[PDB]
Amino acid sequence: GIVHSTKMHRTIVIRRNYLHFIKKYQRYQKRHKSLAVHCSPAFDPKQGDEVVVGQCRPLSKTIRYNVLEVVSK
Amino acid sequence: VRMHGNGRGKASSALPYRRTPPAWLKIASRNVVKMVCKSSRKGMMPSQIGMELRDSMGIAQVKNVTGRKILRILKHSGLAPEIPEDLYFLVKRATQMRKHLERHTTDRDTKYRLILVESRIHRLARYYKRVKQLPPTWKYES
Amino acid sequence: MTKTNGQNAARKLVRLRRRNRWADKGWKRAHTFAAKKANPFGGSSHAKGIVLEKIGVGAKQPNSAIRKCVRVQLIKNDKKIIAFVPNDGCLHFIEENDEVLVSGFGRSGHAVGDIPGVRFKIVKVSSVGLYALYRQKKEKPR
Amino acid sequence: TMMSVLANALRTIASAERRGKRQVLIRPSSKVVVKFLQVMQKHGYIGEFEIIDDHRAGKIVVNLNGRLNKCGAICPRFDCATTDYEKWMKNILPSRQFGFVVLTTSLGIMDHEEARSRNTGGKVLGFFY
RNA sequence: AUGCUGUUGCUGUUAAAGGGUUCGUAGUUGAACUGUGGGCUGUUCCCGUCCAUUCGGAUGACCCUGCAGCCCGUGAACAGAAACAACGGGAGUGGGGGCGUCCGUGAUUUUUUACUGUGACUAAAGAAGCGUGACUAAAGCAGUCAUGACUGAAUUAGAAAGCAUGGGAUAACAAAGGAGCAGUUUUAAAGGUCUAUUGGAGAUUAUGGAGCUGUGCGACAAGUGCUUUCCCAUAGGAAUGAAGGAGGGUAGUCGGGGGAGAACGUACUGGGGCGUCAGAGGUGAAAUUCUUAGACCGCACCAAGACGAACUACAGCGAAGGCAUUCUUCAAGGAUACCUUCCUCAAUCAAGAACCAAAGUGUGGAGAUCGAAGAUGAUUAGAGACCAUUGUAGUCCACACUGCAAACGAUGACACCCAUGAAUUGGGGAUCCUUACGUAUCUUUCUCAGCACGUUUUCUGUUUUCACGCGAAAGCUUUGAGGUUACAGUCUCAGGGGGGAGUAC
RNA sequence: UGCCAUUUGUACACACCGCCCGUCGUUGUUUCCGAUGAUGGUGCAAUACAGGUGAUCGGACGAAAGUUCACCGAUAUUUCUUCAAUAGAGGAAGCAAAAGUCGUAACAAGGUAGCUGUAGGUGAACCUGCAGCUGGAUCAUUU
RNA sequence: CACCAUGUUCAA
Ligand SMILES: *O[C@H]1[C@H](O)[C@@H](N)[C@@H](O[C@H]2[C@H](O[C@@H]3O[C@H](CO)[C@@H](O[C@H]4O[C@@H](CN)[C@@H](O)[C@H](O)[C@H]4N)[C@H]3O)[C@@H](O)[C@H](N)C[C@@H]2N)O[C@@H]1CO
Ligand SMILES: NC[C@@H]1O[C@H](O[C@H]2[C@@H](O)[C@H](O[C@@H]3[C@@H](O)[C@H](N)C[C@H](N)[C@H]3O[C@H]3O[C@H](CO)[C@@H](O)[C@H](O)[C@H]3N)O[C@@H]2CO)[C@H](N)[C@@H](O)[C@@H]1O
Ligand SMILES: NC[C@@H]1O[C@H](O[C@H]2[C@@H](O)[C@H](O[C@@H]3[C@@H](O)[C@H](N)C[C@H](N)[C@H]3O[C@H]3O[C@H](CO)[C@@H](O)[C@H](O)[C@H]3N)O[C@@H]2CO)[C@H](N)[C@@H](O)[C@@H]1O
Ligand SMILES: NC[C@@H]1O[C@H](O[C@H]2[C@@H](O)[C@H](O[C@@H]3[C@@H](O)[C@H](N)C[C@H](N)[C@H]3O[C@H]3O[C@H](CO)[C@@H](O)[C@H](O)[C@H]3N)O[C@@H]2CO)[C@H](N)[C@@H](O)[C@@H]1O
Ligand SMILES: [Mg+2]
Ligand SMILES: [Mg+2]
Ligand SMILES: [Mg+2]
Ligand SMILES: [Mg+2]
Ligand SMILES: [Mg+2]
Ligand SMILES: [Mg+2]
Ligand SMILES: [Mg+2]
Ligand SMILES: [Mg+2]
């Protein structure tokens, strides 16, 4: 995903942007999913940084993923 | 001016195919950089430097004589304007319209044309902030 | 001047079509609930009712007759309607306070040609069929 | 403004060919619009064409030989699988005998007949017949 | 059935339908460029020397994709440069150097996504169908054959997402905005930093490997000449290009474009000043109305408020409403010219903004003329109308509000291609498919090296009678309603039989 | 008064003795407004609170009855919100029906050209003022 | 440019 907001303490919200194909109108459609991802203090990702997240257990009400690598800018 | 208004006017300068100085001019590439950087110390903006070299020195297209462009020569020397030349003359136009409109409260046409120049200002300043020629906090006057 | 291409323009085309299907009087009647809540039959067919009174409805121009029809009050929702009695005779088979089985006739509730403002039809009176009484297949109870 | 340069070029070829001209002047040009024309040369629908060099985008002068009926561009460039060639032939081509659908594939810009033989798929660019 | 829901695939000048005009976000769409290589071998005329005089003659042309090996741009070699992209607790008891694998671990500088080809996984019943005379068939999975035999129940499509892998055209995400920038090896020397062996293990201990930085020195490069460049007698030149896309600049400008000041012009009224005398007015005919306390008329003038005749047109300006005397001013606008600058900044638009005729509204002015309402005449069967005489609100200005037009071209915006002949407005320039060519008129002591014209080019604008093509037709036609069943350049708004009804909430 | 031809306009077509508009009467229908009347559910949160669960005591005969507290919470009642239905004096709009009344607005220069916007007037079609439009009854007259 | 309003219902 790409980092959307880092305003929470030690947790980021990533944004996963994808094109949804409609079988009727032979055309794609921009959709997105946002995920709250726990971010370790090993990492400091800014907004727009591309991260790799790995699924883990529930860590809060919404956190299922956990950042593994940050690709800067 | 096509962007605001109905004008389909096509009046431009058509640059030559043969991008080479004409061999009758013996001025060095080193001296043209001195003349370009000198005119900027007399307060001339890059569009005005090039006409003075075009008209009087015989240097059509400073890029062909010295391999880099006029504003690039100025940025290297530290003599670039603070805000770009496009944005300068649109702001300088927009303040001269507003100083008119403060005493002429019902100039209905110039209030319309002032919307159009400020729409050009907010649309260029979005370009220059994106391309980082302008600081992110820039924010035109009115 | 009509529609949009673009490989990523499907949300525009999906929204554009879902609003223009409401202009279709078949799509709008099949997808709004004023269709059944105002239909005197409860979105169904052949509703029963009780004969209240006999009416002679005069035919529209250029025809000239009076059409023999009863006004019945339905049992499932207590809605008063006027319904036509088809054949030569056949108000002689209907008396007041008779239960009658009333269908529409023809055109999905749009008043088959000559008769003004009547869009239903008697099928069966006193739980014996009304066309069977006409052809004398069988006769009325009691 | 001009959006598709290939759709511009094929529209000026097809217009000047129904007028029965001997040459067209195509402006602007691309790498795509010359690779489309070289498909139209190989199956002899156009003649020799010439790319004039500006230091701008070029211009192309195409010699027409009367054989082209219609060339057009499919916009947007729909993705076409290998199972989908017989669907695109029935839609935009007049017959299965003649006529070509040009596709941009990984292997290059090819017509539909070559791309069926090399077992590839692509995005559809245009057609000529 | 219904291309009557249109992605394929609909309509929108007049049949229902382009929204009054601009700006404008979300949205959708978006110009070109960095390249796909090469070698060998196959596979009769016409042009001249004699005749003839507004018409003849004997006398140099042409004709004979296919397989292999490439430092795979050119440099540079004859393994080095170019371009590239250590664990035995490992392997069915470890397959004296080289070669090359396998497995797992460390150190070294980075490219994805859509698309597309193959796979891997994916319950029957249902669909497709392979066998088979349940008597046929709908079925079903069975059965078929001469102390048991060959057994059958084959196979295929099944949405998207998920998994693996290779192809690199088209597109996409991201970053950059280019002064904001990323010298390689031999050699010996100085200083200085926190594991493996000596039989093991523990504790001390100097030497050394490889790395750390400040040097001198030996080779070779360098995409920008330092045997230079400035001074005077010190990295600064290596960057795609400049879109018949946008922006900005400079230049004479052009126009009923807009704002602000003054000043003119007749006219409609109303006044007095001069004179006149018997009716003026108005109409299809009249009558309301004015008039011997002098109407109408005539002359000069004054006042006030509107309005700028003719010139004034298939003319100009403006985004649309709209704009018509003059002179002094204020800020602008487009076009044109350009070898100026910039370098993708754009197109179109829900939401949101600012304008928007006339009538209307509020508060102040103004109040000449025309004049909804109203009043009188008349016409009429009636006249609440047309016609005549009046007359309130209004008309006009300032500042607010409204936002309702046949706001029209009943035609959305931006690009593209598109035959012909008169004109017109502003700017500029000349006087076997050809290697080029034509210039008059008249005004001219100062907004005057001037003004207008003539012939010809060319850009921008408003159009006209004229080739395709199109349309149900009327008609449209580089100004599309053309380039459309041979149907896809981009975006956007509206329509879906007539009503009810632009009504009710 | 009629007829014939040409031009032009037309909503006429058994064709101007044509067609056609609104008010008003009669009958029937479906909506809407309306003092007032009233129904079924939701949600909101307020108390009261059946039961139980856990704890604390209890300890008749280890362990029943019973205390007390916390928690889950049905139900009851009230407060507004919200959805769906419903009665109503009276006041309207619309539509539909063989030949009732009043005019004549539109179609022709429909006899005052029509029509758009707006404002005011009228039994009723409608008239009137102002600015637009031609879909006009003119593609046209200081060259 | 005085006034000049209207002709029941189907059908042929
Ligand atoms: O921009 C012009 C274009 O480049 C060019 N194709 C031209 O087309 C015609 C040309 O038509 C116009 O005739 C007009 C004269 O009646 C003339 O206008 C010109 O008039 C001159 C005198 N005033 C000039 O001074 C003026 O600037 C200019 N506007 C032409 O424009 C014909 O004359 C030719 N015979 C044929 C060309 N095809 O028209 C474009 C603008 O209309
Ligand atoms: N307007 C009323 C019309 O009546 C129809 O109603 C029904 C009938 O009128 C109609 O019956 C038709 C019959 O009229 C016509 N003459 C022949 C046709 N085969 C029949 O059809 C019927 O009978 C066959 C048997 O062969 C059945 O197989 C078939 O499914 C059935 N539709 O088929 C319909 C099925 O009962 C439509 N349901 C209705 O939508 C439509 O509006
Ligand atoms: N429930 C409200 C009622 O509405 C009534 O009002 C009725 C009338 O005022 C009103 O009049 C309608 C009218 O809308 C429409 N424009 C014309 C229609 N003919 C009339 O209809 C009425 O009048 C006629 C008599 O001529 C009757 O035959 C008819 O049944 C009756 N509904 O329609 C209403 C009923 O449809 C009464 N005021 C009263 O009973 C009560 O208020
Ligand atoms: N029906 C709703 C409306 O009624 C109005 O008009 C209605 C009435 O005013 C009109 O009345 C007409 C009248 O024009 C004409 N002068 C005389 C004629 N007899 C009347 O007719 C009416 O009444 C009789 C019974 O009396 C009915 O048989 C007849 O069907 C009906 N039209 O008939 C119409 C009824 O259909 C509107 N003009 C119209 O817009 C609309 O149709
Ligand atoms: Mg190893
Ligand atoms: Mg440019
Ligand atoms: Mg006077
Ligand atoms: Mg006087
Ligand atoms: Mg009269
Ligand atoms: Mg008057
Ligand atoms: Mg008549
Ligand atoms: Mg009458």
PDB file of N, CA and C (backbone and C1' of nucleotides) in Angstrom, chain C residues 23, chain E residues 4-6 10-18 410 472 494-499:
ATOM      1  N   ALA C  23     -36.412   7.117 -16.168  1.00  0.00           N
ATOM      2  CA  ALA C  23     -37.295   7.703 -17.160  1.00  0.00           C
ATOM      3  C   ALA C  23     -38.090   6.655 -17.919  1.00  0.00           C
TER       4      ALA C  23
ATOM      5  P     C E   4     -34.977   1.037 -30.907  1.00  0.00           P
ATOM      6  O5'   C E   4     -35.171   0.985 -29.330  1.00  0.00           O
ATOM      7  C5'   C E   4     -34.818   2.093 -28.519  1.00  0.00           C
ATOM      8  C4'   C E   4     -35.678   2.173 -27.281  1.00  0.00           C
ATOM      9  C3'   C E   4     -35.795   0.898 -26.465  1.00  0.00           C
ATOM     10  O3'   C E   4     -34.702   0.762 -25.564  1.00  0.00           O
ATOM     11  C1'   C E   4     -37.939   1.908 -26.760  1.00  0.00           C
ATOM     12  P     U E   5     -34.552  -0.498 -24.587  1.00  0.00           P
ATOM     13  O5'   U E   5     -33.015  -0.511 -24.188  1.00  0.00           O
ATOM     14  C5'   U E   5     -32.124   0.507 -24.620  1.00  0.00           C
ATOM     15  C4'   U E   5     -31.261   1.057 -23.507  1.00  0.00           C
ATOM     16  C3'   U E   5     -31.189   0.246 -22.221  1.00  0.00           C
ATOM     17  O3'   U E   5     -29.928   0.465 -21.598  1.00  0.00           O
ATOM     18  C1'   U E   5     -32.072   2.369 -21.758  1.00  0.00           C
ATOM     19  P     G E   6     -28.686  -0.519 -21.831  1.00  0.00           P
ATOM     20  O5'   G E   6     -28.178  -0.139 -23.277  1.00  0.00           O
ATOM     21  C5'   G E   6     -26.825   0.199 -23.495  1.00  0.00           C
ATOM     22  C4'   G E   6     -26.647   0.969 -24.776  1.00  0.00           C
ATOM     23  C3'   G E   6     -26.304   2.443 -24.647  1.00  0.00           C
ATOM     24  O3'   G E   6     -24.913   2.645 -24.539  1.00  0.00           O
ATOM     25  C1'   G E   6     -27.868   2.040 -26.411  1.00  0.00           C
ATOM     26  P     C E  10     -24.896   4.807 -30.121  1.00  0.00           P
ATOM     27  O5'   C E  10     -26.166   4.873 -31.064  1.00  0.00           O
ATOM     28  C5'   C E  10     -27.230   3.949 -30.916  1.00  0.00           C
ATOM     29  C4'   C E  10     -28.568   4.631 -30.904  1.00  0.00           C
ATOM     30  C3'   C E  10     -28.569   6.122 -31.173  1.00  0.00           C
ATOM     31  O3'   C E  10     -28.497   6.437 -32.547  1.00  0.00           O
ATOM     32  C1'   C E  10     -29.924   5.665 -29.309  1.00  0.00           C
ATOM     33  P     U E  11     -28.218   7.942 -33.002  1.00  0.00           P
ATOM     34  O5'   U E  11     -29.652   8.605 -33.035  1.00  0.00           O
ATOM     35  C5'   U E  11     -29.777  10.004 -32.939  1.00  0.00           C
ATOM     36  C4'   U E  11     -30.941  10.415 -32.088  1.00  0.00           C
ATOM     37  C3'   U E  11     -30.922  11.867 -31.697  1.00  0.00           C
ATOM     38  O3'   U E  11     -31.368  12.710 -32.729  1.00  0.00           O
ATOM     39  C1'   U E  11     -31.372  10.587 -29.796  1.00  0.00           C
ATOM     40  P     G E  12     -30.344  13.728 -33.400  1.00  0.00           P
ATOM     41  O5'   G E  12     -30.590  15.066 -32.595  1.00  0.00           O
ATOM     42  C5'   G E  12     -31.897  15.435 -32.204  1.00  0.00           C
ATOM     43  C4'   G E  12     -31.883  16.279 -30.960  1.00  0.00           C
ATOM     44  C3'   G E  12     -30.862  17.387 -30.896  1.00  0.00           C
ATOM     45  O3'   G E  12     -31.247  18.521 -31.631  1.00  0.00           O
ATOM     46  C1'   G E  12     -30.955  16.261 -28.830  1.00  0.00           C
ATOM     47  P     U E  13     -30.334  19.021 -32.836  1.00  0.00           P
ATOM     48  O5'   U E  13     -31.005  20.386 -33.239  1.00  0.00           O
ATOM     49  C5'   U E  13     -30.682  21.605 -32.609  1.00  0.00           C
ATOM     50  C4'   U E  13     -31.392  22.705 -33.330  1.00  0.00           C
ATOM     51  C3'   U E  13     -32.859  22.427 -33.549  1.00  0.00           C
ATOM     52  O3'   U E  13     -33.642  22.845 -32.454  1.00  0.00           O
ATOM     53  C1'   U E  13     -31.853  23.006 -35.606  1.00  0.00           C
ATOM     54  P     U E  14     -34.858  21.950 -31.954  1.00  0.00           P
ATOM     55  O5'   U E  14     -35.906  22.095 -33.123  1.00  0.00           O
ATOM     56  C5'   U E  14     -36.514  23.334 -33.386  1.00  0.00           C
ATOM     57  C4'   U E  14     -37.483  23.221 -34.519  1.00  0.00           C
ATOM     58  C3'   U E  14     -38.469  22.089 -34.389  1.00  0.00           C
ATOM     59  O3'   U E  14     -39.583  22.459 -33.613  1.00  0.00           O
ATOM     60  C1'   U E  14     -37.495  22.062 -36.538  1.00  0.00           C
ATOM     61  P     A E  15     -40.196  21.451 -32.541  1.00  0.00           P
ATOM     62  O5'   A E  15     -40.243  19.914 -33.369  1.00  0.00           O
ATOM     63  C5'   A E  15     -39.559  18.930 -32.877  1.00  0.00           C
ATOM     64  C4'   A E  15     -40.501  17.752 -32.933  1.00  0.00           C
ATOM     65  C3'   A E  15     -40.361  16.972 -31.684  1.00  0.00           C
ATOM     66  O3'   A E  15     -41.415  17.285 -30.856  1.00  0.00           O
ATOM     67  C1'   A E  15     -40.394  15.660 -33.692  1.00  0.00           C
ATOM     68  P     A E  16     -41.218  18.220 -29.570  1.00  0.00           P
ATOM     69  O5'   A E  16     -41.089  17.173 -28.400  1.00  0.00           O
ATOM     70  C5'   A E  16     -41.375  17.533 -27.065  1.00  0.00           C
ATOM     71  C4'   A E  16     -40.468  16.790 -26.133  1.00  0.00           C
ATOM     72  C3'   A E  16     -39.014  17.202 -26.184  1.00  0.00           C
ATOM     73  O3'   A E  16     -38.769  18.334 -25.367  1.00  0.00           O
ATOM     74  C1'   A E  16     -39.191  14.843 -26.245  1.00  0.00           C
ATOM     75  P     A E  17     -38.080  19.658 -25.944  1.00  0.00           P
ATOM     76  O5'   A E  17     -36.717  19.723 -25.144  1.00  0.00           O
ATOM     77  C5'   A E  17     -36.568  19.004 -23.932  1.00  0.00           C
ATOM     78  C4'   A E  17     -35.245  18.303 -23.881  1.00  0.00           C
ATOM     79  C3'   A E  17     -34.115  19.063 -24.528  1.00  0.00           C
ATOM     80  O3'   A E  17     -33.536  19.949 -23.608  1.00  0.00           O
ATOM     81  C1'   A E  17     -34.147  16.848 -25.342  1.00  0.00           C
ATOM     82  P     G E  18     -33.005  21.380 -24.065  1.00  0.00           P
ATOM     83  O5'   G E  18     -31.655  21.497 -23.261  1.00  0.00           O
ATOM     84  C5'   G E  18     -30.454  20.977 -23.801  1.00  0.00           C
ATOM     85  C4'   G E  18     -29.508  22.104 -24.068  1.00  0.00           C
ATOM     86  C3'   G E  18     -29.733  22.811 -25.390  1.00  0.00           C
ATOM     87  O3'   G E  18     -29.979  24.234 -25.276  1.00  0.00           O
ATOM     88  C1'   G E  18     -27.486  21.979 -25.235  1.00  0.00           C
ATOM     89  P     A E 410     -31.788  29.616 -35.294  1.00  0.00           P
ATOM     90  O5'   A E 410     -31.823  28.362 -34.339  1.00  0.00           O
ATOM     91  C5'   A E 410     -33.031  28.008 -33.709  1.00  0.00           C
ATOM     92  C4'   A E 410     -32.940  28.053 -32.212  1.00  0.00           C
ATOM     93  C3'   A E 410     -32.400  26.798 -31.576  1.00  0.00           C
ATOM     94  O3'   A E 410     -31.900  27.107 -30.280  1.00  0.00           O
ATOM     95  C1'   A E 410     -34.731  26.983 -31.166  1.00  0.00           C
ATOM     96  P     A E 472     -33.051  10.048 -42.226  1.00  0.00           P
ATOM     97  O5'   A E 472     -34.347  10.565 -42.958  1.00  0.00           O
ATOM     98  C5'   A E 472     -35.065   9.736 -43.843  1.00  0.00           C
ATOM     99  C4'   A E 472     -36.339  10.396 -44.262  1.00  0.00           C
ATOM    100  C3'   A E 472     -36.178  11.778 -44.850  1.00  0.00           C
ATOM    101  O3'   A E 472     -35.948  11.741 -46.249  1.00  0.00           O
ATOM    102  C1'   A E 472     -37.794  11.834 -43.138  1.00  0.00           C
ATOM    103  P     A E 494     -28.046  16.422 -16.482  1.00  0.00           P
ATOM    104  O5'   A E 494     -29.199  16.352 -17.564  1.00  0.00           O
ATOM    105  C5'   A E 494     -30.230  17.316 -17.567  1.00  0.00           C
ATOM    106  C4'   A E 494     -30.889  17.432 -18.913  1.00  0.00           C
ATOM    107  C3'   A E 494     -31.779  16.293 -19.338  1.00  0.00           C
ATOM    108  O3'   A E 494     -33.043  16.279 -18.706  1.00  0.00           O
ATOM    109  C1'   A E 494     -30.411  16.874 -21.124  1.00  0.00           C
ATOM    110  P     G E 495     -33.775  14.877 -18.472  1.00  0.00           P
ATOM    111  O5'   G E 495     -34.318  14.511 -19.907  1.00  0.00           O
ATOM    112  C5'   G E 495     -35.224  15.353 -20.588  1.00  0.00           C
ATOM    113  C4'   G E 495     -35.601  14.732 -21.893  1.00  0.00           C
ATOM    114  C3'   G E 495     -36.159  13.342 -21.754  1.00  0.00           C
ATOM    115  O3'   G E 495     -37.535  13.376 -21.440  1.00  0.00           O
ATOM    116  C1'   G E 495     -34.535  13.376 -23.464  1.00  0.00           C
ATOM    117  P     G E 496     -38.154  12.458 -20.289  1.00  0.00           P
ATOM    118  O5'   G E 496     -38.648  11.196 -21.089  1.00  0.00           O
ATOM    119  C5'   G E 496     -39.154  11.358 -22.399  1.00  0.00           C
ATOM    120  C4'   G E 496     -39.054  10.095 -23.202  1.00  0.00           C
ATOM    121  C3'   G E 496     -39.553   8.835 -22.506  1.00  0.00           C
ATOM    122  O3'   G E 496     -40.431   8.145 -23.376  1.00  0.00           O
ATOM    123  C1'   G E 496     -37.459   8.451 -23.497  1.00  0.00           C
ATOM    124  P     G E 497     -41.889   7.762 -22.867  1.00  0.00           P
ATOM    125  O5'   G E 497     -42.836   8.217 -24.046  1.00  0.00           O
ATOM    126  C5'   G E 497     -42.330   8.692 -25.274  1.00  0.00           C
ATOM    127  C4'   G E 497     -43.476   9.124 -26.136  1.00  0.00           C
ATOM    128  C3'   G E 497     -44.346  10.201 -25.539  1.00  0.00           C
ATOM    129  O3'   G E 497     -43.826  11.498 -25.709  1.00  0.00           O
ATOM    130  C1'   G E 497     -45.710   8.469 -26.265  1.00  0.00           C
ATOM    131  P     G E 498     -44.088  12.608 -24.593  1.00  0.00           P
ATOM    132  O5'   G E 498     -45.606  13.010 -24.803  1.00  0.00           O
ATOM    133  C5'   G E 498     -46.049  13.610 -26.005  1.00  0.00           C
ATOM    134  C4'   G E 498     -47.538  13.812 -26.001  1.00  0.00           C
ATOM    135  C3'   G E 498     -48.086  14.693 -24.904  1.00  0.00           C
ATOM    136  O3'   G E 498     -47.931  16.070 -25.182  1.00  0.00           O
ATOM    137  C1'   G E 498     -49.394  12.755 -25.079  1.00  0.00           C
ATOM    138  P     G E 499     -47.535  17.087 -24.013  1.00  0.00           P
ATOM    139  O5'   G E 499     -48.118  16.404 -22.710  1.00  0.00           O
ATOM    140  C5'   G E 499     -48.798  17.177 -21.738  1.00  0.00           C
ATOM    141  C4'   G E 499     -50.156  16.611 -21.441  1.00  0.00           C
ATOM    142  C3'   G E 499     -50.713  16.936 -20.074  1.00  0.00           C
ATOM    143  O3'   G E 499     -51.307  18.214 -20.002  1.00  0.00           O
ATOM    144  C1'   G E 499     -51.011  14.645 -20.532  1.00  0.00           C
TER     145        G E 499
END
